[PDB]
């Protein structure tokens, strides 16, 4: 037989196609999967892997996080691609013009960007303008801010958050959380 | 009456009866994998019965092909029969077991006109005989 130096038939960890049944979503793939083939343009490969992600890994990108990136030196006229949803923010005021191509815009977010004289584009109108993806800025949402991960790797002295239903002083504040009662963590 | 195709080799022709299906009457002949911990079948001792497994797979070119070199597509009535018209060198119409003696003469007679192989040409129609 063989001596196997690694596990056999082991399939790559990666999503090869969106686990969603959304018809229109699978269309988008059909487009970009063809572009990833017939252009070099590392950009297109990035988008294709992006379409596949689960909703947890396509966290919302604020409007203000777009505004921030357009203030990076020399970036003014770049068009910013977000695969995922763009959302509104009430916190910024004076908003630049530009263009933003995304999977989804919430209503407020769309009204925010057009009222500034800008433009809202889908992923395909993005491919017609930029087949290679010329002059485009790809952004990602802050995926470690998600609530659930406050609990990850929970363990002594890890500074992580106990999974718990309701918080008051009678809940897990006593023995092992302070030196007066037993020890501290 | 068909496309040429490679020669069909079934590669295992025994039926794979269940272990001990012969010995006890309560045990039916449909296959079932022996799950037991001591089992001499599950462990593959020499001279015990074969187990079905994917290696006995049939060639993709000839799979679902009848000996006549056809696939057999089940047909309930005259308007079904007419879905096969193009593929007449590929698929061979079978007539559904429950069709009446009277409607079969109409299926057969209409499939003669289209040149389609019927795989059970003598139904209750030779039963009129």
């Amino acid at each position: 037989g063989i001596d196997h130096t690694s596990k056999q038939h082991k399939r790559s960890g990666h999503r090869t196609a969106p686990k969603s049944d959304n018809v229109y979503l699978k269309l988008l793939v059909k487009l970009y999967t063809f572009l990833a083939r017939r252009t070099d343009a590392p950009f297109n490969k990035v988008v294709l892997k992006a379409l596949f992600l689960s909703k947890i890994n396509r966290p919302p990108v604020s409007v203000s996080r777009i505004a921030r990136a357009l203030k990076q030196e020399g970036a003014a006229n770049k068009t910013v691609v977000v695969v995922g949803t763009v959302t509104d923010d009430a916190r910024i005021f004076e908003f630049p013009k530009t263009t933003v191509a995304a999977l989804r815009f919430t209503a407020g977010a769309r009204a925010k960007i057009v009222k500034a004289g800008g433009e809202c584009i889908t992923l395909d109108q993005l491919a017609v303008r930029a087949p290679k993806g010329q002059n485009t800025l790809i952004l990602r949402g802050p995926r470690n801010s998600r609530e659930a991960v406050r609990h990850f790797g929970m363990g002594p002295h890890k500074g992580k958050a106990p999974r718990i239903l309701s918080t008051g002083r009678k809940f897990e504040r006593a023995r092992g959380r302070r030196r007066s009662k037993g020890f501290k963590v | 009456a068909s496309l040429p195709h490679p020669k069909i080799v079934k590669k295992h022709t025994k039926k794979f009866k269940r272990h001990h299906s012969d010995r006890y009457h309560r045990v039916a002949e449909n296959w079932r994998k022996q799950k037991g911990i001591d089992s001499v079948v599950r462990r593959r001792f020499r001279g015990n019965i074969s187990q079905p497994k994917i290696g006995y797979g049939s060639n993709k070119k000839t799979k679902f092909l009848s000996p006549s070199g056809h696939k057999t597509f089940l047909v309930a009535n005259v308007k079904d029969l007419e879905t096969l018209t193009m593929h007449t060198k590929t698929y061979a119409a079978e007539i559904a077991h429950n069709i009446s003696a009277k409607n079969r003469v109409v299926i057969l007679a209409r499939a003669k006109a289209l040149g389609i192989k019927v795989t059970n040409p003598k139904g209750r129609l030779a039963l009129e005989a």
Partner: protein, 175 residues
Amino acid sequence: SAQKAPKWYPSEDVAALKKTRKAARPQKLRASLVPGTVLILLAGRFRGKRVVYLKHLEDNTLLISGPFKVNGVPLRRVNARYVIATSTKVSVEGVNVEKFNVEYFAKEXXXXXXXXXXXXXXXXXXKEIKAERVEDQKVVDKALIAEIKKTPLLKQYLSASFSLKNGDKPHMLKF
């Protein structure tokens, strides 16, 4: 529907074969066989008889006489591998042989309606021979027979049939 109509069906176009590279070269006979050599027929109707080798035909067979007026084997085709060639020899020089080709030996075309109808119903339907063959058998023989009267005992030899006796170990016997 008794069964739901499939989503594909294949194309009924039957693809042509690839251009094959095989050339039909000339067959090369083994060393032993030379025109005039005496042969031993190893199967068939005349199996066991010893016979005389004339020409090598286009279809890779061997033209044969024997000759007929001796051992009663006619002109005939024989496949090269069904023979044992002996080391003894007669001169085929004065023999024509230039006439006989593959077409000459062509069997009469058999009919599928007549070979069922005349074979089954009449089992007494009798064979006949083309007057031609029987004459061109004569011609061959009168040259051959005249040569066979040169060497002693040869005439008896060809008429007498060959077989293995006890203790005969064919991997030994020289022939």
